[PDB]
Design a protein around this ligand. Sequence first.
Ligand code: HEM
Ligand SMILES: [Kr]
Ligand SMILES: [Kr]
Length: 148
Amino acid sequence: RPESELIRQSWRVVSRSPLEHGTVLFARLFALEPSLLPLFQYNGRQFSSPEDSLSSPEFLDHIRKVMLVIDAAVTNVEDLSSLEEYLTSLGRKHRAVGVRLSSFSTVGESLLYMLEKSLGPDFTPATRTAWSRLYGAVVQAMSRGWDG
Ligand code: HEM
Ligand SMILES: [Kr]
Ligand SMILES: [Kr]
Protein backbone atom coordinates (compact mmCIF):
# COMPACT_ATOMS: atom_id res chain seq x y z
CA ARG A 1 0.00 0.00 0.00
CA PRO A 2 1.07 3.64 -0.53
CA GLU A 3 -1.04 5.21 2.22
CA SER A 4 -0.09 2.54 4.79
CA GLU A 5 3.50 3.78 4.52
CA LEU A 6 2.31 7.40 4.77
CA ILE A 7 0.61 6.52 8.11
CA ARG A 8 3.54 4.46 9.36
CA GLN A 9 6.13 7.17 8.57
CA SER A 10 4.07 10.03 10.07
CA TRP A 11 3.18 8.12 13.25
CA ARG A 12 6.91 7.42 14.01
CA VAL A 13 7.73 10.94 15.22
CA VAL A 14 4.44 11.36 17.16
CA SER A 15 4.73 7.93 18.81
CA ARG A 16 8.08 8.88 20.35
CA SER A 17 6.28 11.12 22.85
CA PRO A 18 2.62 10.05 23.03
CA LEU A 19 1.71 11.99 26.19
CA GLU A 20 3.10 15.30 24.82
CA HIS A 21 1.29 14.83 21.52
CA GLY A 22 -1.88 13.47 23.19
CA THR A 23 -2.00 16.57 25.39
CA VAL A 24 -2.18 18.73 22.19
CA LEU A 25 -5.04 16.54 20.91
CA PHE A 26 -7.09 16.90 24.15
CA ALA A 27 -6.36 20.59 24.62
CA ARG A 28 -7.67 21.11 21.05
CA LEU A 29 -10.71 18.87 21.79
CA PHE A 30 -11.88 20.93 24.75
CA ALA A 31 -11.29 24.16 22.88
CA LEU A 32 -13.66 22.97 20.14
CA GLU A 33 -16.24 21.17 22.34
CA PRO A 34 -16.06 22.26 26.06
CA SER A 35 -19.19 20.19 26.87
CA LEU A 36 -17.00 17.03 26.82
CA LEU A 37 -15.09 18.12 29.99
CA PRO A 38 -17.70 16.82 32.54
CA LEU A 39 -17.61 13.32 31.09
CA PHE A 40 -14.28 12.66 32.91
CA GLN A 41 -15.30 11.96 36.49
CA TYR A 42 -12.42 10.82 38.65
CA ASN A 43 -12.78 10.67 42.44
CA GLY A 44 -16.48 11.62 42.04
CA ARG A 45 -15.65 15.16 40.79
CA GLN A 46 -16.11 17.23 37.59
CA PHE A 47 -13.19 19.29 36.16
CA SER A 48 -14.18 23.00 36.12
CA SER A 49 -11.76 24.14 33.36
CA PRO A 50 -9.75 22.39 30.68
CA GLU A 51 -6.43 23.17 32.48
CA ASP A 52 -7.84 21.20 35.53
CA SER A 53 -7.83 17.99 33.42
CA LEU A 54 -4.09 18.36 32.66
CA SER A 55 -3.26 18.17 36.43
CA SER A 56 -5.10 14.82 36.87
CA PRO A 57 -2.94 11.66 36.75
CA GLU A 58 -6.03 9.62 35.75
CA PHE A 59 -6.82 11.98 32.90
CA LEU A 60 -3.21 11.85 31.70
CA ASP A 61 -3.35 8.02 31.96
CA HIS A 62 -6.39 8.14 29.61
CA ILE A 63 -4.34 10.22 27.10
CA ARG A 64 -1.78 7.36 27.07
CA LYS A 65 -4.66 4.83 26.61
CA VAL A 66 -6.00 6.80 23.62
CA MET A 67 -2.54 6.94 22.02
CA LEU A 68 -1.99 3.19 22.53
CA VAL A 69 -5.28 2.45 20.70
CA ILE A 70 -4.17 4.65 17.80
CA ASP A 71 -0.80 2.81 17.86
CA ALA A 72 -2.75 -0.46 17.48
CA ALA A 73 -4.65 0.99 14.49
CA VAL A 74 -1.32 1.87 12.81
CA THR A 75 0.06 -1.61 13.59
CA ASN A 76 -3.07 -3.07 11.91
CA VAL A 77 -3.35 -0.41 9.16
CA GLU A 78 -3.40 -3.05 6.36
CA ASP A 79 -6.34 -4.96 7.96
CA LEU A 80 -8.47 -3.31 10.65
CA SER A 81 -10.87 -6.30 10.74
CA SER A 82 -8.77 -7.90 13.46
CA LEU A 83 -9.42 -4.93 15.80
CA GLU A 84 -13.17 -4.71 15.08
CA GLU A 85 -14.34 -6.54 18.20
CA TYR A 86 -12.08 -4.65 20.56
CA LEU A 87 -13.19 -1.36 18.99
CA THR A 88 -16.91 -2.26 19.20
CA SER A 89 -16.61 -2.91 22.93
CA LEU A 90 -14.60 0.34 23.37
CA GLY A 91 -17.58 2.08 21.72
CA ARG A 92 -20.04 0.43 24.18
CA LYS A 93 -17.84 1.58 27.12
CA HIS A 94 -17.81 5.18 25.82
CA ARG A 95 -21.57 5.19 25.18
CA ALA A 96 -21.91 4.02 28.85
CA VAL A 97 -19.75 6.88 30.15
CA GLY A 98 -21.93 9.30 28.18
CA VAL A 99 -20.04 10.21 25.02
CA ARG A 100 -22.27 10.85 21.96
CA LEU A 101 -21.14 9.11 18.79
CA SER A 102 -21.09 12.46 16.96
CA SER A 103 -18.44 13.77 19.43
CA PHE A 104 -15.98 11.32 17.79
CA SER A 105 -15.92 13.58 14.67
CA THR A 106 -14.51 16.39 16.87
CA VAL A 107 -11.95 13.92 18.18
CA GLY A 108 -11.00 13.24 14.54
CA GLU A 109 -10.52 16.95 13.85
CA SER A 110 -8.37 17.13 17.02
CA LEU A 111 -6.20 14.21 15.90
CA LEU A 112 -5.71 15.78 12.44
CA TYR A 113 -4.91 19.11 14.09
CA MET A 114 -2.24 17.49 16.27
CA LEU A 115 -0.65 15.72 13.28
CA GLU A 116 -0.72 18.96 11.21
CA LYS A 117 1.05 20.89 14.06
CA SER A 118 3.69 18.17 14.65
CA LEU A 119 4.47 17.35 11.01
CA GLY A 120 4.36 20.89 9.58
CA PRO A 121 5.47 20.89 5.94
CA ASP A 122 5.47 17.07 6.04
CA PHE A 123 1.67 16.99 6.51
CA THR A 124 0.95 16.58 2.80
CA PRO A 125 -2.62 16.46 1.48
CA ALA A 126 -2.10 12.70 0.89
CA THR A 127 -1.11 12.37 4.57
CA ARG A 128 -4.30 14.14 5.69
CA THR A 129 -6.42 11.89 3.44
CA ALA A 130 -4.70 8.73 4.68
CA TRP A 131 -5.31 9.61 8.34
CA SER A 132 -8.93 10.68 7.66
CA ARG A 133 -9.55 7.23 6.13
CA LEU A 134 -7.87 5.32 8.98
CA TYR A 135 -9.61 7.33 11.75
CA GLY A 136 -12.87 6.95 9.79
CA ALA A 137 -12.56 3.17 9.90
CA VAL A 138 -11.72 3.14 13.62
CA VAL A 139 -14.86 5.17 14.31
CA GLN A 140 -17.00 2.93 12.07
CA ALA A 141 -15.88 -0.07 14.16
CA MET A 142 -16.56 1.81 17.42
CA SER A 143 -19.99 2.97 16.19
CA ARG A 144 -21.22 -0.66 16.43
CA GLY A 145 -21.10 -0.24 20.24
CA TRP A 146 -23.93 2.30 20.10
CA ASP A 147 -26.79 -0.28 19.87
CA GLY A 148 -25.34 -1.30 16.50
C1 HEM B 1 -14.71 11.98 23.00
C2 HEM B 1 -13.53 11.84 23.61
C3 HEM B 1 -13.36 10.80 24.75
C4 HEM B 1 -13.84 10.86 26.01
C5 HEM B 1 -14.73 11.97 26.63
C6 HEM B 1 -13.41 9.66 26.70
C7 HEM B 1 -13.65 9.29 28.01
C8 HEM B 1 -13.27 8.08 28.59
C9 HEM B 1 -13.72 7.61 29.88
C10 HEM B 1 -14.67 8.35 30.84
C11 HEM B 1 -13.16 6.41 30.12
C12 HEM B 1 -13.39 5.57 31.40
C13 HEM B 1 -12.48 6.12 32.52
C14 HEM B 1 -11.02 5.93 32.21
O1 HEM B 1 -10.51 4.78 32.30
O2 HEM B 1 -10.33 6.93 31.88
C15 HEM B 1 -12.34 6.07 28.96
C16 HEM B 1 -11.58 4.92 28.82
C17 HEM B 1 -10.80 4.54 27.74
N1 HEM B 1 -10.58 5.26 26.56
FE1 HEM B 1 -11.54 7.12 26.15
N2 HEM B 1 -12.64 8.94 25.83
C18 HEM B 1 -12.59 9.58 24.63
C19 HEM B 1 -11.91 9.12 23.53
C20 HEM B 1 -11.17 7.96 23.39
C21 HEM B 1 -10.73 7.47 22.11
C22 HEM B 1 -11.05 8.18 20.76
C23 HEM B 1 -10.03 6.34 22.32
C24 HEM B 1 -9.38 5.46 21.23
C25 HEM B 1 -8.33 5.90 20.53
C26 HEM B 1 -9.99 6.08 23.75
C27 HEM B 1 -9.37 5.03 24.42
C28 HEM B 1 -9.75 4.59 25.67
C29 HEM B 1 -9.38 3.31 26.27
C30 HEM B 1 -8.45 2.25 25.64
C31 HEM B 1 -10.06 3.28 27.65
C32 HEM B 1 -10.02 2.14 28.70
C33 HEM B 1 -11.35 1.44 28.41
C34 HEM B 1 -11.79 0.32 29.34
O3 HEM B 1 -11.99 0.49 30.57
O4 HEM B 1 -12.01 -0.78 28.82
N3 HEM B 1 -10.70 7.09 24.37
N4 HEM B 1 -12.42 7.13 28.03
KR1 LIG C 1 -6.76 19.11 28.01
KR1 LIG D 1 -6.52 6.38 13.92
